[PDB]
């Protein structure tokens, strides 16, 4: 909290009265003169200009707005101490502000409708097709992008509403029960879901369309 | 980053390889003798013992496990430097670790079923009752507990599904339309929802049972 300082952390999407005092930095030299503090770098004087500011006479670094981990995850500013006589009394101290994640992004399926086909007579347990979703949040150090899949519904609900099932982790849709009848119900429209936080958080849905078929090249 | 240090921040529910290097503290008498570091306090040697540790020979403060802002939001540890011949070279420095929030708690209705009554003939716009929900997350500096109410459904849906409406912020259910026939349908079972992140995040539901009647005491 002088001219020596470790990496600071600020959470994205914070609210409250802005600007907020992040940490303060000072120069011992101020007892022998008057010192003026300044910061430079992207987020400071270079674009995005203005996110961060430092009160000249006190060394108070502040954030002037809510951050967004997905736009810019880390900033690298430099502090400068200049004396009343326009003399650099300190060498530029690099300051690194890391933006910590928040779960503000719903998972997203790689397609709006995935399509597949299953052979009529396929033994229960046979793999049909796979669905996919991605989440913009931090998968390195949070569960804010830990996706778990589920089947919200089947259409038509015949013979019964549980013909297929999807592996909660992998997203692979398998045939759960027997009774696929191509001549009465040739196409299933399942509504899969993907929820982050291992199935607990924010969710999203996309459809999977399965075609029941007599495997052997039919006419 | 010598012996003076700003308050550290660690987000709750972090994942990854543990223990994670938090920040490195250093003493200045380590040039004359070998200095060993130790930390003390709740979270260190006092319950919850072991959350934080410090590498004796290096001064590397680490987190040995995922934190939970809802259990303990702030820790207060102290660092101690002792020279090879068992003598404190530096005073015990106070270290403050703050645990930042994460939206990992669903809102909750104060009741499992709220009950009310509306007089038959009540002018549209009249206030019927109020519903309530709370969220355990940080309302001081995040939206992780910003609740927004909505009516998911009405039962019976007669005369129609929009008999009532709830104020998204306050949670007050008012009569939206006219046509309250207590004779045939004297009871309405509404399913309200509360979702944090101002209606965008995690949600929960509870029912509201409205009983239409003849205002002036009927028997
Ligand atoms: Ca964001
Ligand atoms: Ca995020
Ligand atoms: Ca997410
Ligand atoms: Ca928690
Ligand atoms: Ca929380
Ligand atoms: Ca919450």
PDB file of C-alpha atoms and ligand atoms in Angstrom, chain B residues 12 70 101-102 104-105 137, ligand 5:
ATOM      1  CA  UNK B  12     -16.822 -17.895  -2.586  1.00  0.00           C
ATOM      2  CA  UNK B  70     -22.860 -17.042   3.708  1.00  0.00           C
ATOM      3  CA  UNK B 101     -20.423 -13.123  -3.351  1.00  0.00           C
ATOM      4  CA  UNK B 102     -21.709 -15.577  -5.965  1.00  0.00           C
ATOM      5  CA  UNK B 104     -25.692 -19.598  -5.499  1.00  0.00           C
ATOM      6  CA  UNK B 105     -28.878 -19.163  -3.456  1.00  0.00           C
ATOM      7  CA  UNK B 137     -26.997 -13.450  -1.302  1.00  0.00           C
TER       8      UNK B 137
HETATM    9 CA1  LIG C   5     -23.706 -16.128  -2.345  1.00  0.00          CA
END
